[PDB]
């Protein structure tokens, strides 16, 4: 795989630095690397594809070395370089597609795709150029562990889950109390609602608590915590827990008082913040406990007093919510983001050629299921296909 990356990097460098009029001093080392690649790949046969609709293709290499007796590149040089580079780029693109489409329940790190399996031999170590990109560097470190980390912007670590729990309820759903929430992408929006405005709660304070269990620990995350979950601040009708009947929900937004937010790793509290909003940080956290409260206002204007009565009718229902965006984070394992098209590339490759559902990944690369159940074999396969997708993106966009 390091060899595949080296192929892609040297072809990218050839397309970039071998340009008309450039000094040979600017591309001497690159030309030497290109000639090593040519001499190593020459006199070989590779076979690519043959799964789903990915058509079978045969690659044979017999090319002349780029010259070296030129002080300053001219137009004729670049024509020969182009004729070689386009074929090589097509070959690397097809190898990457073949590698991405495949899977393996066991030893998912080891390369599938007999083309790449051949490239992992002993004759092709001489192509190894350098491993600068974040994905390939972390690939090397993981293959021989030093501590690693991918920095992600707004990582979709939560599986999509919108739901609710009712700590107090009735069959006719007039006097409810509990929480609603939506975890999606990098958003946790949790709204605790009480239909009685904590009329009879101890000290007129109702307690809400939401536990989120990340599937992988995040590191040095930046978190924007604000009050007033928006999605649960307008009237709705909600199918019940059983689904038999629907119940109305008519929010009136109070603020959450003495909100505490705890970032835990392996059960111990790593970070804790109390009534701090805006941007905060979490050192290393695996679960989030958002605890907040609904205090009935001691003093009340005529209007709010008319809103919150002491009897059962309860036309309007008090709610307090939090919104929590993980703006950025650092994860040892790989994840989709909002800034990287790796997952999009892999899924598009599979969809284009209609690969049958394999043993490990879920159908359609459904990221919600994939993050919901994220076993280590699935993680290894995801890392392999993602790094190969990065290697492809270095040339094909």
């Amino acid at each position: 795989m390091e060899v595949l990356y080296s192929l892609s990097k040297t072809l990218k460098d050839a397309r970039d630095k071998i340009v008309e009029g450039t000094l040979y001093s600017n591309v001497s080392d690159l030309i030497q690397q290109f000639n090593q690649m040519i001499v190593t790949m020459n006199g070989n046969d590779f076979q690519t594809g043959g799964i789903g609709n990915l058509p079978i293709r045969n690659w044979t290499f017999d090319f002349g070395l780029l010259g070296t007796t030129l002080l300053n590149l001219d137009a004729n040089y670049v024509e020969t370089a182009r004729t070689t580079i386009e074929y090589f780029i097509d070959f690397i693109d097809n190898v990457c597609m073949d590698e991405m489409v495949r899977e393996s329940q066991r030893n998912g790190v080891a390369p599938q795709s007999e083309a790449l399996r051949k490239l992992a031999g002993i004759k092709f170590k001489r192509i190894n150029f350098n491993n600068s990109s974040e994905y390939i560097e972390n690939w090397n470190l993981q293959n021989r562990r030093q501590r690693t980390g991918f920095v992600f912007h707004k990582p979709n670590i939560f599986p999509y889950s919108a739901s609710f729990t009712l700590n107090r309820s009735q069959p006719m759903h007039d006097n409810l109390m509990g929480t609603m929430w939506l975890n999606a992408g990098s958003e946790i929006q949790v709204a605790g609602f009480d239909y009685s405005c904590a009329l009879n709660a101890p000290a007129n304070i109702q307690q809400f608590e939401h536990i989120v269990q990340l599937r992988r620990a995040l590191t040095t995350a930046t978190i924007t915590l604000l009050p007033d979950a928006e999605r649960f601040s307008f009237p709705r009708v909600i199918n019940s827990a059983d689904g038999a009947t629907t119940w109305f929900f008519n929010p009136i937004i109070l603020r959450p008082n003495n909100v505490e937010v705890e970032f835990l790793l392996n059960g111990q509290i790593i970070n804790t913040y109390q009534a701090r909003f805006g941007t905060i940080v979490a050192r290393n956290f695996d679960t989030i406990r958002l605890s907040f409260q609904l205090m009935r206002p001691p003093n009340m204007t005529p209007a709010v007093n008319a809103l919150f009565p002491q009897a059962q009718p309860f036309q309007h229902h008090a709610t307090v919510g939090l919104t929590l965006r993980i703006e950025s984070a650092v994860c040892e394992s790989v994840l989709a983001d909002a800034n990287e098209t790796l997952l999009a590339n892999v899924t598009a490759v599979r969809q284009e050629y209609a690969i049958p559902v394999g043993p490990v990944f879920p159908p359609g690369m459904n990221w919600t299921e994939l993050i919901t159940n994220y076993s280590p074999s699935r993680e290894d396969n995801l890392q392999r296909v993602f790094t190969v997708a990065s290697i492809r993106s270095m040339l094909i966009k």
Binding site: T165, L166, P171, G243
Partner: protein, 276 residues
């Protein structure tokens, strides 16, 4: 143990569920009309219960479900109102000077109550909170109270001379008296003809519904002055002919039971739980 009160029920907001907890210990739901005797008087018929049962059979209620029950007048029905039955509708013929008695019967039946006795002649009683009332029912109740000081000396009334007591309900079949919450009280009424009970108010009995047959909207079940809620079950109609009223109820019966919900129903027929 319980019915799983102390643990939460979870549900998804983006999925429509299929399987249901089918449970039934019944013949089927039973609609149940209470109508004043003047209705049958004006109708002047007597195959009319059969006629209405045939109508309800078209509307979807089997024969042996619907029941019809006559009461003389609302004030006399108030004394110990029994709802022996599943889906209760009560037709209250509004007329002037019965506003309080109607509103009070509505307050009694529409709401669930938890009542303890009151050995009136021995102790002195208070009212714990906003949901606590004294409900007195009988042939003729006449409640005369007397608040007491912290020293157990009457204020505005000598505790011995009953004539000085403050009358709060005079000769009524049903009187739901609220007095000041936190004052000991000595109570006097006609123990043979009336029974007084210390009743807390639980949630609302979401089973019985009240159709006001006559005019303006006056039903204020909530004894509080500030709040005057208009519940879904405080239905009303404009009437001239009881036949038209009954046809209206029959035609729109499905909507009425959609407003109601039969899940709240007790074993006994009483309008209030009794907890000695």
């Amino acid at each position: 143990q319980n019915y799983g009160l102390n643990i939460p029920i979870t549900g998804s907001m983006d999925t429509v569920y299929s399987n249901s907890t089918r449970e039934e210990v019944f013949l089927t739901s039973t609609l149940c009309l209470y109508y004043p005797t003047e209705a049958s008087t004006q109708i002047s018929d007597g195959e009319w219960k059969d006629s209405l049962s045939q109508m309800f059979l078209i509307k979807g209620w089997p024969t042996g479900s619907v029941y019809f029950k006559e009461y003389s007048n609302i004030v006399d029905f108030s004394v110990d109102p029994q709802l022996y039955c599943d889906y209760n509708l009560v037709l209250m013929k509004y007329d002037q000077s019965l506003e309080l008695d109607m509103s009070e019967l509505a307050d009694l039946i529409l709401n669930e109550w938890l009542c303890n006795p009151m050995d009136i002649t021995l102790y002195y009683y208070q009212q714990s909170g906003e949901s606590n009332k004294w409900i007195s029912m009988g042939s003729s109740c006449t409640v005369k109270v007397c608040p007491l000081n912290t020293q157990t000396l009457g204020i505005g009334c000598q505790t011995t001379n009953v004539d000085s007591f403050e009358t709060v309900a005079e000769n009524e079949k049903l009187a739901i008296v609220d007095v000041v919450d936190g004052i000991n009280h000595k109570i006097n009424l006609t123990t043979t003809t009336c029974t007084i009970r210390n009743c807390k108010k639980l949630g609302p009995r979401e089973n019985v519904a009240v159709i006001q047959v006559g005019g303006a909207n006056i039903l204020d079940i909530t004894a509080d002055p500030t709040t005057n809620p208009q519940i879904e079950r405080m239905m009303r109609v404009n009437w001239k002919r009881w036949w038209q009223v009954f046809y209206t109820i029959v035609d729109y019966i499905n909507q009425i039971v959609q407003v109601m919900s039969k899940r709240s129903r007790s074993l006994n027929s009483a309008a209030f739980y009794y907890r000695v």
